[PDB]
Design a protein around this motif. Structure first.
Motif, PDB file in Angstrom:
ATOM      1  N   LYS A  14       0.832  -1.197   0.000  1.00 13.09           N
ATOM      2  CA  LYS A  14       0.000   0.000   0.000  1.00 13.09           C
ATOM      3  C   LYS A  14       0.871   1.252   0.000  1.00 13.09           C
ATOM      4  CE  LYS A  14      -4.210  -0.035   1.366  1.00 13.09           C
ATOM      5  NZ  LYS A  14      -5.409   0.464   0.640  1.00 13.09           N
ATOM      6  N   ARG A  15       1.971   1.203   0.745  1.00 10.61           N
ATOM      7  CA  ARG A  15       2.875   2.348   0.824  1.00 10.61           C
ATOM      8  C   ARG A  15       3.451   2.672  -0.550  1.00 10.61           C
ATOM      9  NH1 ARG A  15       5.965   0.392   6.258  1.00 10.61           N
ATOM     10  NH2 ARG A  15       4.364   0.967   7.747  1.00 10.61           N
ATOM     11  N   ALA A  16       3.832   1.634  -1.288  1.00  8.26           N
ATOM     12  CA  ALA A  16       4.387   1.822  -2.625  1.00  8.26           C
ATOM     13  C   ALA A  16       3.349   2.451  -3.552  1.00  8.26           C
ATOM     14  CB  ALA A  16       4.840   0.479  -3.198  1.00  8.26           C
TER      15      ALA A  16
ATOM     16  N   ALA B 148       0.929   4.435  -2.761  1.00  8.78           N
ATOM     17  CA  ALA B 148       0.778   5.845  -2.415  1.00  8.78           C
ATOM     18  C   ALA B 148       1.862   6.678  -3.089  1.00  8.78           C
ATOM     19  CB  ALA B 148       0.870   6.021  -0.895  1.00  8.78           C
ATOM     20  N   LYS B 149       3.089   6.167  -3.072  1.00  9.41           N
ATOM     21  CA  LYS B 149       4.205   6.865  -3.698  1.00  9.41           C
ATOM     22  C   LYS B 149       3.999   6.974  -5.204  1.00  9.41           C
ATOM     23  CE  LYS B 149       9.113   6.712  -4.607  1.00  9.41           C
ATOM     24  NZ  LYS B 149      10.397   6.043  -4.255  1.00  9.41           N
TER      25      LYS B 149
ATOM     26  N   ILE C  22       1.522   9.721  -6.089  1.00  8.35           N
ATOM     27  CA  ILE C  22       2.129  11.039  -5.942  1.00  8.35           C
ATOM     28  C   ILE C  22       3.105  11.306  -7.086  1.00  8.35           C
ATOM     29  CG2 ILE C  22       3.673  12.430  -4.556  1.00  8.35           C
ATOM     30  CD1 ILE C  22       2.568  10.886  -2.136  1.00  8.35           C
ATOM     31  N   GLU C  23       3.912  10.301  -7.413  1.00  8.16           N
ATOM     32  CA  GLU C  23       4.889  10.439  -8.488  1.00  8.16           C
ATOM     33  C   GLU C  23       4.192  10.725  -9.810  1.00  8.16           C
ATOM     34  OE1 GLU C  23       7.450   7.194  -8.973  1.00  8.16           O
ATOM     35  OE2 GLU C  23       8.583   8.095 -10.569  1.00  8.16           O
TER      36      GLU C  23
ATOM     37  N   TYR D 290      -2.987  14.211  -4.348  1.00 13.29           N
ATOM     38  CA  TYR D 290      -3.105  12.876  -3.775  1.00 13.29           C
ATOM     39  C   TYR D 290      -4.210  12.840  -2.728  1.00 13.29           C
ATOM     40  CZ  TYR D 290      -2.268   8.640  -1.193  1.00 13.29           C
ATOM     41  OH  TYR D 290      -2.425   7.420  -0.566  1.00 13.29           O
TER      42      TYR D 290
END
Ligand SMILES: [Zn+2]
Lengths: 73, 64
Positions: free
Chosen positions: B2-4, B6-7, B10-11, B53
């Protein structure tokens, strides 16, 4: 309900939370790394620091309150 | 992972703002090249990407 055509596509829901519980905002460290990862973006940048300050303020409201001199007059 | 994710979001938003669709005409307010959008700095774009985001703004390009 497959048995009933009317039921199908009607009153049908498919909840999918669970993992949705995880909140990114609850992980400032990860967010900081993301901004740093971006090109031309550095943690030493005033804009980045300002954004975090504003976001942090909105996320949490200060409970500080004057105990004296309430009336400026 | 999930963290990936989110990144990645944003990217994508950051690059979309700094890149856009490349087309002069765009119906997406939050997209580069869009007449309603103005060029932003690396730091400014980063802030806009972060804000996008939060609102989960839709990207100009179609979803996979
Ligand atoms: Zn566009």
């Amino acid at each position: 309900s497959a048995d009933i055509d009317a039921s199908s596509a009607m009153d049908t829901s498919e909840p999918a939370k669970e993992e949705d519980d995880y909140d990114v905002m609850q992980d400032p460290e990860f967010l900081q790394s993301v901004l740093e990862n971006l090109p031309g973006v550095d943690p030493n940048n005033e804009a980045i620091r300002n954004a975090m300050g504003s976001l942090a303020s909105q996320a949490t409201k200060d409970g500080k309150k004057d105990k004296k001199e309430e009336d400026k007059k | 992972m999930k963290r990936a994710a989110a990144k990645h979001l944003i990217e994508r938003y950051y690059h979309q703002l700094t890149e856009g669709c490349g087309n002069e005409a765009c119906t997406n307010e939050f997209c580069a090249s869009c007449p309603t959008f103005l060029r932003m700095d690396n730091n400014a774009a980063a802030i806009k990407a972060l804000e996008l985001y939060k609102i989960n703004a839709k990207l100009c390009d179609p979803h996979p």
